[model samples]
Target: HMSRRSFKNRVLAFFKGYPSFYYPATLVAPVHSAVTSSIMYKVQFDDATMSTVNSNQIKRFFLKKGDVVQSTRLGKIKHTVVKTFRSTNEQLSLIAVDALNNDMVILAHGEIEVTVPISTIYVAPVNIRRFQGRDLSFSTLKDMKFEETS
Candidate 1:
């Protein structure tokens, strides 16, 4: 579709969570070639968690420098979302949700409804109000450090 999207640039890749939920990461290296099942690569997460991932991992990648965004790359609405990572920021995240097609889907939850593929010039701000331990972002979230042992 887009001519073997080059991995030359460091990209914000999807990782760390379930398909039901997901995280954003980087494709650290192109170590695997699909002579078998899709391509594989070294995936380094924003939380320092790393893995070798494959199978269309590159199928959904984002640019760190570009202001562009994917409609399905939802954030801030809670049940499951990926936190936007700064070079020195923790897992501080907020509500994000997946939205597609449309001018009226994400209308007025007050979170700035975005209709993508347009030049809206948006930044998906992940509000990490309290993130010490991961919490659910399903409408409400509270991430804080606790002495309570897991």
Candidate 2:
């Protein structure tokens, strides 16, 4: 089996070749209201591509600035990439979202570890919506089950 660090490095290398432009994104996991806290690490995404690969094939998601995100818990929401923060250890991207029909902000860590489960949501560029300004923090996010919508 491949190690998580190796997998992450491979994904990073694959994305390094692509241009950093707007692309559809999705939230693959559920966000826990209680887990809303700034997670710091050293990482960066310079023209990096977000992807998931398996033995069968590779899947990619290009995230743009203005994108609409549908959350199982928050329902249909608007989002935008306001700013990106980086460090020697990890990279953190600031995401502004109209969650629960209200304005909120959250941080997304660029580094992905196999041991750590997937994200609270899968961001894709396919869906677009008018984004609201960031006013609240992750504390505003409510606790809910991982609801899968088709």
Candidate 3:
């Protein structure tokens, strides 16, 4: 079982190092900016489906090729396993953020919750040419689905 603190930290660290980490991570202002006994804010996931308006607010979101699901949104998380298979048994979560460029919502996903920083985010399909010796490509289509045309 993963502890809450560790889970939160993992999420935060992931966001603080966005783009370079295989996905785009961003940060949003705390829902409530009041400096009280406690302060908390919800993170958003900015995937292909979501609009770029809210992209900047996200602290970070998960974008691994073969992790759990295609993507996880902010404030949305998984708590139950649907299947027996590990691949199918993993949970999904989303974090939402406010965008600086646009007024739309940015979302992120994860198996657990964590506190993330806004500076660690990087662009997706991070240039791996140095390691693979090839040019990088970006796909707007999800899951690499394609049709065969003869």
Candidate 4:
């Protein structure tokens, strides 16, 4: 016969065996990013919805395909993922060109993959030139949703 404690444990185990129900969450940002590349697992965002500024004009607010992302380290960047072995090298790098045409390399660990909306990205222009000639590292920039100023 099961004791009182064992009976309670069995009841708890029955509930835990099934997946818990989840409430649907809303998307609040104007632009969203994700890591679509399977190779390097680089973070990327979804395309911006075209907005009509005027009857004849359309405005693009989100990052688009082939749109140049200006960064202090990576210069004039573009990327495509190819099937490759998981990099044993912990140092993953991204290169970008600053407004001044200086080439820079931003290095971080290989597991840092994140994608989120542009509205979530925090920008501070003052920090742009602060970390020049050095690497910036973060455990999970996705949670912070912060972007370096260009």
- Each candidate's lDDT (Cα)? 0.32, 0.26, 0.26, 0.20
User: Whose TM-score is greatest here?
Assistant: 1
**What is the descending TM-score order?**
1, 2, 3, 4
lDDT of 1 by residue, 1-150 (tens): 111212222233345355422344434445534366564556554455666655333222222222223334354332211222222223322111111111112222234543332112122223222222222123221222232664
Cα RMSD to the true fold for all candidates: 16.9, 19.1, 18.7, 23.0
Candidate 2, 8-55: lDDT as tens digits: 221111121344222222222223333444321112232232343221
Candidate 1 regions exceeding 4 Å error are: 1-8, 16-20, 33-37, 59-150
> What TM-scores do the predictions have?
0.33, 0.24, 0.18, 0.15
Better of 2 and 3 by TM-score: 2
Candidate 1: clashing residue pairs, number: 14
1-150, model 4: which lDDT tens digit per residue? 111111001100001112321111111112223433221111121121111111111111222222222322333232211111222234321111111112222222243322322222211222222323322123212232245782
Question: lDDT tens string, model 3, 1-150?
Answer: 111121121122123332333333222223333344343333323441211222232232322322222123222242221211112223322222212211122223434433333222333332221122111122211121132672
Residues forming the 10-long window of minimal summed lDDT in candidate 3: 1-10
Taking all chains together, the TM-score of candidate 2 against the true structure is 0.24
Question: Which residue window of length 10 is worst by lDDT in model 4?
Answer: 6-15
Q: Give candidate 4's error at residue 123 in angstroms.
A: 1.9
User: How many backbone clashes can be found in candidate 3?
Assistant: 45
Best by lDDT: 1
